[PDB]
């Protein structure tokens, strides 16, 4: 009645106070992303004590005491003066939405109104402070409260809103109704060679900027897109569209035995061999039983240790799904394996 | 470039002299089955030193110095006088055929004529000492050189000849050409309720004896049948028929979350919960992704230790194919993952 | 060149930010004693990065940013309102003096003026705020800055000032010179049956209060007294007198094979078997070659895990001394084993 | 109620059948010494199941079925033809005497007449087949049944007969009475520079051959002599004489922090650093409380793994004595710690 990979992640990456630590940065940082991934994993494992401790740390240290009052700062860690505090008070909306979803599903599944209330206040603040109306698209999720919107252009991160989370949020009405449809546009229209970009810009009156560009590559952010798509229920119509769109990533992984590290989104030119977390991300995405067992072998023989936050969380998501640690319903709800 | 489950099995179950030890028996036995499984696993791991050591011990201690001269004795262990020697000189043909196949495929893949010579001499002797012509069937593989054939009846063990091995042996002509077809008959015609029996008798003029009987149950022997069927390539025409015949075993494991320990073959009534090795045996057999993931979780969280020979060898087979440790071609050859 | 027991203590008990955590208290506390023991052990291990991290945390969280400005609060942990802060701002002078000694010896051995400046300021403040003149004795070290000196009743803790630390501090003049002498009086005059008390009172015009009393027992605080005596160099003239005074503790441990949990100081009656850390504390204190080995075997076979802060630090001191992890010179300096 | 180092030694070095395996040798050998050390350790550990298993293997495979009928072959392992059998049927008298003592003390302590009968038969055969009268000495223990006694040049090994065993055997009368004395002569008269030789010759008239020679060095055999001396009871008159004779070995180890690998017995010149087993052999021998703890640290931090039979059995003897796993009485009996 435990999730062993989650138990090891707690022992190596989560402090006694409840903060998720990326040991590879010299400042030993916590991100709102890491906190939200801890909350998700604790929910899926039915680990309410860990959920509460992580939530407490998040509220006290990223949100000045309350997620009902402000979106969490995305970056926390050690300053030069030996003090540990917020390093960047801007938000990161992938952290924000995973937090809000985890809180709402914890409130529903553990029958705790407090979680529902916090997750509701959080989601409404996401809608009012990070969602904006983009001419030519409609409502769109910005990657953060500031820095991604100009007068005539906007920058988006396809990995930030999993289609299952978007489906779930539609129950709360606008703007999530529209976001479920504009998120599908973001995923399907920005992969001209079958690879989703880490980052992509949209300009008023012109559309997506898909000419070759430094951050228009499929690497560490975008590897999650394929994973989120793999996690969709087979009865979701968008799933087949999305799997067909990204088929060249699956094809590459099948032919070479590994996912690439970086893919030029405009040319489809691949470089490097992705780390173990990328192979974990391929487990829900790949549909052939044999190609899946190649990635399943690579994850099992190179399982991340304590020096690799991002490989470990990618493995929690991808290998966890591979072992039925959680599922998503047709309404985007958690179907727990408790 | 190692198979970790296999390396652990070597360290906990195989002596320095190359004998595979079942620790649960007070006589600390070795079987021809265990030796053949060790040879198979060593070939699949590309572990030629282990293979040579285990073959040496087999020839010296089970075959009085040569598998070319006699089928291996099936049971070796400690006698009451403190001496360690053969306990039963009869053969077990599942060990015999796995030995023969492993020797032939090692000769081919490692380009070593000695292995081919021993394997061919072994297979020829199997054909001449344990295969007999049964009125109503044709050539049939007996479970053992003696004790399974009377004047008008015979007793068979469906688990002994995996279809991929039978397909491989056809290349050597008769009787293996016929045995490939009569093995299918043995598997398909003795499972009236969708469950294969550990043991089943055939009487001249009467046919299969499928009335309820103590050993006409699907338990520790017959669990391998499903696994062997799961390991057939999809391009094998027999595989669809066999999967369909045994669908009630899959259906039970999907609905309940575990394979059963014992199923009455005449009624289909099932009892108990099978050990972890049975869940491993289900991994190649189950076609549903979710049911396959449930069994995968059970194998991962209850992986066999040093006190469970049979669960471990079933996990080597079942979890090893789940992780692409070996594949069988359409002609029954080893497609190695080296 | 590492100290494995210390490496394991860091991984199980010291937070990334440098706080030493006692997991057995539900508030997950840090004490000034824990911080000072971590500083000592990092110095002994030649672990300067750990030393700096622990020092930073101590200054920021126990000393409002600076050990030059105040003695550290002795108790920090989780409050009922979910925040983490000082729980009791009173000092504990055992942590204070271990911290000062460690800083001064770090300054000397690592040639860092900053450690010397902090240690000197801390030691001078200990003199000003915790040392008082007691009629009949002279200068005396109080267990803390408030609560231990009343109308005519002072309360002292014999385990607080190890004779080697007192020797080291004499280099700074008064009150440490005379203190070295009053500490000997405290140790030698309050053990009428050969056992040192956890706590003992001195009353004006009456003297030591040595009538049986709840806290006049040799238990969890006092076990350190024997250890500190065992750690004195054989060339310290006080050593032989103390070993003779405390001989009944050694005789008990030798005759019974374990140290007692609780001894009535007034009568010598012992109750219970001390935990593993008590056996580690006996290692420097014993002088036969047969009793020591018995205690060594108990520590080796019952080595503390992750749920046992006090057993673990007692083991770092006593087993670390038993493996030559540090020595004390005749002047109380660290003779490091780097 | 287990001896953890012995439990691990069984798991890594002792086969299921009960043979002690040296893994460094390509023939994976068992020696009579290894079997005797396994028997001793199992007795010390009160592991009667291991003792019986090891004794069974010893009798069946080194003594053609019975230690009552012949001394054990000293060397057993794999031949080039792949079979496993006796490699040298000559004896090694160190294994012989440890096996005899262990059987006699198992018979006495476990009240089992069978062990006494076998041990007595073995000891009387040792006297008949390996003990000879040497002009100028008297009865002497040869290192083996054949090859160590010629025209007038006998060869002896000072490490073979521990003084505690010689004391124990005196209870059986001649030749063990005088032997006890000539063994003292051998140890005290062949170390002119304070170091005992691995091997030393004696010639009629000319006496001990103590001029420098390739085998007249203190190395892997002779390291045991110091350890056996250290294991004598303090009330044995011979112990102080032997400790004084061998003072230079203790002085070297104290001054340098490690025992040497090889010492010229004629000059006292030392070379190299002895492996961890030599440090363990110094634990009973070294008499300071602070020297006995540098070596203790070296054993703790470099504890032998699975690839180091000799270091491991030296550690079982030396660290086991250091932890009170066994003691010897003034009559050479086992004082068990059970």
Author numbering:
A (entry chain A), B (entry chain C), C (entry chain D), D (entry chain B): 23 to 360
The article reads:
Phosphoethanolamine (pEtN) cellulose is a naturally occurring modified cellulose produced by several Enterobacteriaceae. The minimal components of the E. coli cellulose synthase complex include the catalytically active BcsA enzyme, a hexameric semicircle of the periplasmic BcsB protein, and the outer membrane (OM)-integrated BcsC subunit containing periplasmic tetratricopeptide repeats (TPR). Additional subunits include BcsG, a membrane-anchored periplasmic pEtN transferase associated with BcsA, and BcsZ, a periplasmic cellulase of unknown biological function. Cellulose is a common bacterial biofilm component produced by a variety of prokaryotes, such as Escherichia coli (Ec), Salmonella enterica, and Gluconacetobacter/Komagataeibacter xylinus (Gx). These Gram-negative bacteria synthesize cellulose and secrete it across the cell envelope via the Bacterial cellulose synthase (Bcs) complex.
To our surprise, however, we discovered homo-oligomerization of the cellulase. Single particle cryo-EM analysis at a resolution of about 2.7 Å revealed the presence of BcsZ tetramers, in addition to small monomeric particles, Figs. 5d–f and S3g, S12e and Table S1. The homodimer interface is formed by helices 11 and 12 of the glycosylhydrolase-8 fold. It is rich in ionic interactions, including Asp344 and Arg318 of one protomer and the equivalent residues in the symmetry-related subunit. Combined, these interactions create a square-shaped tetrameric assembly with the cellulose-binding clefts of BcsZ subunits at opposing corners facing in the same direction. However, because BcsZ binds cellulose in a defined orientation, the 2-fold symmetry-related subunits bind their polymeric substrate in opposing directions, Fig. 5e. Oligomerization of BcsZ may optimize the enzyme’s ability to interact with and digest cellulose to increase catalytic efficiency, as frequently observed for carbohydrate-active enzymes. Collectively, our results indicate that cellulase activity is critical for cellulose export.
